[PDB]
Amino acid sequence: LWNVFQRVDKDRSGVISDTELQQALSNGTWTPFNPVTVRSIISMFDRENKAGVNFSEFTGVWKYITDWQNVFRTYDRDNSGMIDKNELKQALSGYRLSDQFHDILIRKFDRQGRGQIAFDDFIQGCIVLQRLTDIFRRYDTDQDGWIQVSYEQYLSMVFSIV
Amino acid sequence: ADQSFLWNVFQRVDKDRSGVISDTELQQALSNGTWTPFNPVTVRSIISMFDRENKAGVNFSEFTGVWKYITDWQNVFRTYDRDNSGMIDKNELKQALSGYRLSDQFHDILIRKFDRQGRGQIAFDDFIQGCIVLQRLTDIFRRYDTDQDGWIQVSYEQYLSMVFSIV
Ligand SMILES: [Ca+2]
Ligand SMILES: [Ca+2]
Ligand SMILES: [Ca+2]
Ligand SMILES: [Ca+2]
Ligand SMILES: [Ca+2]
Ligand SMILES: [Ca+2]
Numbered sequence: 001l002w003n004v005f006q007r008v009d010k011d012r013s014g015v016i017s018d019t020e021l022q023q024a025l026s027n028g029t030w031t032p033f034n035p036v037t038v039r040s041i042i043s044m045f046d047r048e049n050k051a052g053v054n055f056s057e058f059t060g061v062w063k064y065i066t067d068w069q070n071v072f073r074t075y076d077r078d079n080s081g082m083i084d085k086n087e088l089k090q091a092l093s094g095y096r097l098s099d100q101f102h103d104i105l106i107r108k109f110d111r112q113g114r115g116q117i118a119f120d121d122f123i124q125g126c127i128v129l130q131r132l133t134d135i136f137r138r139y140d141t142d143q144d145g146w147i148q149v150s151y152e153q154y155l156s157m158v159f160s161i162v
Numbered sequence: 163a164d165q166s167f168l169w170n171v172f173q174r175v176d177k178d179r180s181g182v183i184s185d186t187e188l189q190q191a192l193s194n195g196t197w198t199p200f201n202p203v204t205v206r207s208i209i210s211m212f213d214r215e216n217k218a219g220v221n222f223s224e225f226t227g228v229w230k231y232i233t234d235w236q237n238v239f240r241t242y243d244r245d246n247s248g249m250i251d252k253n254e255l256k257q258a259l260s261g262y263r264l265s266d267q268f269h270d271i272l273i274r275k276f277d278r279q280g281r282g283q284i285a286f287d288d289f290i291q292g293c294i295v296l297q298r299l300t301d302i303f304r305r306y307d308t309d310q311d312g313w314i315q316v317s318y319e320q321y322l323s324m325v326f327s328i329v
Contacts, residue, residue: 034225044236070265097319098319101319102324104322104326108326128329129232132321132322132325133318136318137324145317145318146315146317146318147315147316147321148313148314149313149314149315149316150312150313151300151303151307151312151313152264152268154299154303154314155268155296155299155303156271158299158325158328159271160283161325161329162328
């Protein structure tokens with residue numbers, strides 16, 4: 001791990017920045033790992049609001065990304081290195097989502113634009129879905145799948161998301 | 163033709179002379195009456211509204227849209243800042259946002275949400291920000307509130323679609 005951390009710390013400054021974390025990562029493509037995802041992950045582990053991670057926080061970041069990669073690999077059952085619609089259907093089977101909705105999700109998080117989902121966009125869409133579903137559940141106390149909300153509640157709800 | 167004096171404004175802002183005003187260039191050119199830099203999120207949104215090339219920036223031809231847009235906001239802002247103190251308070255905010263028919267206390271929620279100076283008033287950049295977000299969120303709400311009683315009822319998947327429209 002130590003050895004891995006120094007390698008990522010390009011300028012040897014003892015703190016891994018966004019840029020540095022991004023260049024250590026591959027989305028399986030010719031494009032950069034999504035800088036929005038790099039930053040969500042860093043702010044999860046950085047406790048001194050400094051847009052960076054030191055070694056002990058980096059052990060947390062690295063475990064987390066490697067665990068996501070394990071998930072990605074588990075469901076990419078043709079080893080194509082992209083999650084296609086039916087693989088996503090497997091991956092999200094615990095959400096009880098319709099076929100039509102998986103297309104919407106792909107449209108939304110697929111940055112490559114070919115109707116498949118790369119590792120970075122996989123992480124992004126999974127975390128967004130998860131955050132949103134939890135916020136939804138705060139309203140759906142009777143777990144019937146429907147909510148009824150006033151204009152003011154709705155706004156506050158969006159203010160709580162983003 | 164066309165416009166000589168806007169060109170000067172453009173070059174001052176375009177410090178690197180790349181021919182494109184970036185996010186940071188625009189932010190450094192803009193003032194909020196404060197020592198904290200102009201809301202970077204507000205800057206990015208304005209750039210996104212006028213950029214037709216997806217280059218994270220605006221060229222001269224788009225910048226005349228930017229100049230007009232920011233200037234129009236200055237006028238709306240100076241209009242509701244009735245005492246010309248350079249911040250908008252609850253009382254002023256209530257006047258600005260009449261047409262929304264928002265409850266009294268919701269105004270405090272808006273102030274907390276968007277005032278980054280933490281004094282209970284809203285500077286010019288944070289004012290644009292909340293108004294942009296309010297109008298955008300409201301149009302999305304109106305789409306779902308076909309009858310306009312102020313209520314929506316959505317499924318989980320509809321809820322997710324609606325949030326995807328916004329985020
Ligand atoms: Ca470093
Ligand atoms: Ca696959
Ligand atoms: Ca319910
Ligand atoms: Ca420039
Ligand atoms: Ca005032
Ligand atoms: Ca309604």
